[PDB]
Amino acid sequence: AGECLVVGDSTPIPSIVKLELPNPEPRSQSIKFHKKWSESWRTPSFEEVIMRWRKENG
Amino acid sequence: KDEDIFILTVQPVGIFKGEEFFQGNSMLPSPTEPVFLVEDDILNKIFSNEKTKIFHLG
């Protein structure tokens, strides 16, 4: 984790490098399953905007 | 031919430096080095750990 293969013409020895931690780190598009399940049942008020599914057709 | 041989082939899967478990294939033990089985006290620390995100599966 955190290491890459720098293979190319710009290096004498293509090697694996220990990249440092970026600052600031980008947005992480990850959803954790169990913690969300660990909470009580999500009770969504039914505004019922399925026009999301419907009108986004083109 | 009267030669009692009991040889095992094992593969390292981690280290127990201090009181916490690290992975990696390093720190080769020197010859004539004791082997001490495994107790549940260290196995529990490897597997159960202590965190909210756990899931029993046997």
Side-chain angles (χ1 to χ4, degrees):
Chain A
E3 298 170 4
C4 82
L5 278 68
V6 191
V7 176
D9 291 331
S10 52
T11 190
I13 321 174
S15 296
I16 297 89
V17 194
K18 186 61 203 170
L19 290 152
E20 300 213 334
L21 283 72
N23 213 20
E25 190 277 331
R27 207 203 66 201
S28 60
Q29 45 170 357
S30 70
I31 315 171
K32 298 309 199 285
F33 280 35
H34 192 65
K35 68 181 178 67
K36 295 326 281 173
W37 292 352
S38 160
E39 324 177 349
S40 186
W41 191 76
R42 296 295 86 193
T43 312
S45 166
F46 293 100
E47 293 83 3
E48 185 164 355
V49 176
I50 312 190
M51 316 181 291
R52 294 179 293 173
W53 197 336
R54 288 290 168 77
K55 78 166 184 44
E56 190 277 331
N57 218 17
Chain B
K1 215 182 173 289
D2 283 324
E3 177 92 354
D4 291 331
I5 301 299
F6 314 76
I7 287 189
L8 270 65
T9 295
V10 311
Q11 184 178 2
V13 298
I15 190 167
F16 182 76
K17 182 175 73 175
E19 182 65 26
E20 65 183 1
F21 182 88
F22 304 102
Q23 293 179 357
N25 290 318
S26 296
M27 295 298 102
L28 289 192
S30 305
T32 314
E33 182 65 26
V35 182
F36 276 120
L37 260 175
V38 180
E39 41 177 355
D40 63 358
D41 295 329
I42 62 170
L43 263 183
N44 277 342
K45 293 177 195 160
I46 297 169
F47 287 120
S48 294
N49 270 309
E50 205 50 78
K51 182 62 66 68
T52 43
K53 39 171 88 186
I54 62 170
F55 182 63
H56 212 291
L57 188 153

